[PDB]
Design a protein around this ligand. Structure first.
Ligand SMILES: Nc1ncnc2c1ncn2[C@@H]1O[C@H](COP(=O)(O)OP(=O)(O)O)[C@@H](O)[C@H]1O
Lengths: 482, 473
């Protein structure tokens, strides 16, 4: 009954159904009058530890199959030839079966990362022309959609299994075996708790667990020459299932009353998400003058939300990509969003993302489509997502039906009031307590239209110059910017 | 065992086999040369293969059956072509050695250019003889295959099969089940007739397969029924909310849709009817279309989603449309629901940018009808009826249905009521703020704003609702 964390109900049903039909001895099958199942296939999110489950299932099934492993290339050797190899590993099993065919020989073959002749070749051997039963094959792959339709139909690959999101209980099981083995030996860390580690991590793949533990062992080794495990949690992954420090370089200072209101509105939106059975997908956008500060805000809302899976989207990664490539990466993030039950994703600089250009205007249709469908597109039942898009220009986006898509729109306006500007200055703490007073004297009777990103940059600009100069220069700079 | 296909199968069977069967002077009295081959084209899952193996078995004590790999032509250098010629060669050799009477060889090509075309054609017919053998070809689509083979002679008879007859389906399930019956063990809950009524599409093969999954399932249990559970799981998502009926128009559209269905299924005169939904987003029309599809209970109903097609090349989108639609043809009748009509095009108002090629593929097919003995209904959802008419595609669609989201206050409250989110008091206040006035919001944003309001404290919910609805106007 070991070892595989979580995946017990689904695994149990699948297992008993594939193995049991074989297991009942021996008249029952004839009583059943049913030919044995040909293969079982599993598709999972990456890192869900599909492979370990498969090796284990194969081991459990027979005293010794004894396991057959297929290289990823599969088809290596061009001249004839490789195709023949894919046929050939099957060939040994079929040969044994013909030599002893009736009962009772089983051979297990597994293809990891599963066109022309090879498609057909696998299909012919797995089913027909005559027999080819008494063996089973399991295929493990990250995405269902990529694989061929013909294999799927009941028969050659009758049963398809989709791996469940990793269990908390399960997470406790995988960590529990390594930890326990350590427990069994006298050495252990008192501070570390199994339940606690499980509650702390939701996203991680199996693999991840051995990795975290291994890093902890290494740090411990370092101590000899929380603790090590904590250091590992802090660094080691690389999980693949969010750095906000790269999107909030400058702190969400409560510069203006509007700032607090934009964030509370972000709070309102997350709260909207929390249940939202009636609406599965939450779409939100921030619209601001350039240098608006909308995007840091979006990132901050995401940090605040702490939904189980958050992945940042960057214009910068997209740069220099083919329009199709741009669509593709974006697609991959979209499916990644699918995995979490409650989830938040960021789309940023969408005008920039689109490659939208003022002259023309010229823009990317394919990119626009991926973007358009997504808001409309529905996450698998259960699991939900909120999308935050930061857009510099509201009207063009409204113009392409993009605005229509969003559930909520938030516009971030640069404060038009000097005193609020002052409040901002005070929070940033750039100017001396004298300078704040001076700015306060100047602002009255004057109207300011400047962005926080722009304001902070402006401030910073005024500051470098000498102290008598800073007050005058900043005022002049403000005047020019106005 | 072969489910359904007893009349058609019987006639075909008789015509190929009987002409051979009458012994032996009768054929000369007929004075007709024996038929060369029989070819069958079926929907996927039509169990063509089993019928063929069975037919071959039935025909001779032992042919004994020849199977052709899908590649057929594997080995480039000379060579493969020669192989396609060569399997024929053994049969011709036997026939020359004993030619007159009485040797028959059966060869079957599953999933049936240059030299191979000619090669198969030359061996099957001419130059001299080549009779005393028969070949059956099994393929999913008729249109793909070559014209030359089809003409009477080399492939005189072409058979098209409409899935498995209900009585027949009962026969195949009945044999495996009966064998199960004969032994003491059986499932009381499972009924033969019931299984037959439940399944229309499935191949024989499918039946042994289903039984297999269920047996495997009994097999799951010891250390309707199982079949029902399989229907429940083994192979809703689109409309998680379900549909409220706020206005007589909302209900009226689902009813009109039901009427379109009735017409499509019921009436011979028009093979096809097109159902069109007109709304401005964020309209719920997409949902209405799904509903329409569900009440119909058409044997095959498929709703196609752009996201499934997302990021595809022009050709790929077009191919998907072709595939779905080919799938629909094969069934006696079907309802196909088309979604995001603007998006398939990838129309963008700036530009204009759109893909013409895809537009022609949809436009041409829509007018197009399945082969006789079958009828279909196509439903599409369009954001922008005006742009569509401007294409002139709209003229092509059989019927137009338009709902402008929610337009009156009565319709609004009726929706809030069917959804049941606000308290009697709250709705009593909302009505006092909308009744008489004009509103204009699609159903889904409503489902959204409602949730955006349930988020505020028990007293700030109503006010927040009226604020949101005040913006979505
Ligand atoms: N209320 C706010 N919303 C967004 N960003 C803010 C806010 N207040 C302060 N910031 C700061 O603004 C900066 C980000 O500006 P950015 O997101 O690039 O704006 P834009 O997208 O309008 O160009 C961050 O460095 C962050 O510390």
């Amino acid at each position: 009954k070991m070892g595989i964390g979580g995946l017990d109900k689904e695994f149990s049903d699948i297992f008993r159904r594939a193995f049991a039909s074989r297991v009942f001895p021996p008249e029952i099958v004839e009583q059943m009058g049913c030919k044995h199942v040909k293969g079982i296939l599993l598709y999972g999110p990456p890192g869900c530890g599909k492979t370990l489950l498969a090796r284990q299932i194969g081991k459990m099934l027979n005293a010794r199959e004894p396991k057959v492993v297929n290289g990823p290339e599969i088809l290596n050797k061009y001249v004839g030839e490789s195709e023949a190899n894919i046929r050939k590993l099957f060939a040994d099993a079929e040969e044994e079966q013909r030599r002893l065919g009736a009962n009772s020989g089983l051979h297990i073959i597994i293809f990891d990362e599963i066109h022309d002749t090879v498609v057909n070749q696998l299909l012919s051997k797995i089913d027909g022309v005559e027999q080819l039963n008494n063996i089973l094959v399991i295929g493990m792959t990250n995405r269902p959609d990529l694989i061929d339709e013909a294999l799927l139909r009941p028969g050659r690959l009758e049963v398809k299994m989709e791996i469940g999101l990793p269990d908390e209980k399960g997470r406790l099981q995988i960590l529990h075996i390594h930890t326990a083995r350590m427990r069994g030996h006298q050495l252990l860390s008192a501070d570390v708790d199994i339940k606690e580690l499980a509650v702390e991590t939701k996203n991680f793949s199996g693999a991840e667990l051995e990795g975290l533990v291994r890093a902890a062992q290494s740090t411990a080794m370092n101590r000899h020459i929380d603790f090590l495990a904590s250091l590992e949690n802090d660094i080691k992954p690389a999980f693949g299932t969010e750095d906000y420090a790269s999107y909030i370089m400058n702190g969400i200072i409560k510069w203006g009353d509007p700032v607090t209101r934009v964030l509370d509105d972000g709070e309102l939106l997350v709260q909207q998400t929390k249940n939202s059975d009636r609406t599965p997908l939450v779409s939100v956008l921030l619209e601001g003058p350039p240098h608006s500060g909308k995007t840091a805000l979006a990132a901050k809302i995401a940090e605040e939300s702490n939904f189980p899976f958050i992945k940042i989207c960057s214009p910068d990664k997209m740069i220099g990509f083919s329009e199709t490539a741009k669509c593709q990466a974006m697609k991959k993030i979209f499916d990644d969003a699918y995995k979490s039950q409650l989830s938040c994703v960021v789309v940023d600089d969408i005008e920039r993302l689109l490659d939208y250009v003022p002259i023309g205007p010229r823009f990317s249709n394919l990119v626009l489509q991926a973007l358009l469908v997504l808001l409309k597109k529905a996450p698998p039942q259960g699991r939900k997502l909120l999308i935050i898009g930061t857009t510099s220009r509201k009207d063009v986006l409204q113009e392409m039906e993009m605005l229509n898509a969003f559930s909520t729109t938030i516009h971030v306006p640069n404060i038009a009031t000097g005193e609020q500007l002052l409040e901002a200055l005070e929070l940033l703490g750039n100017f001396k307590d004298k300078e704040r007073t001076t700015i306060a004297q100047q602002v009255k009777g004057k109207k300011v239209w400047i962005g926080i990103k722009k304001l902070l940059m402006l401030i910073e600009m005024s500051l470098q110059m000498d102290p008598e100069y800073r007050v005058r220069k900043f005022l002049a700079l403000l005047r020019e910017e106005g």
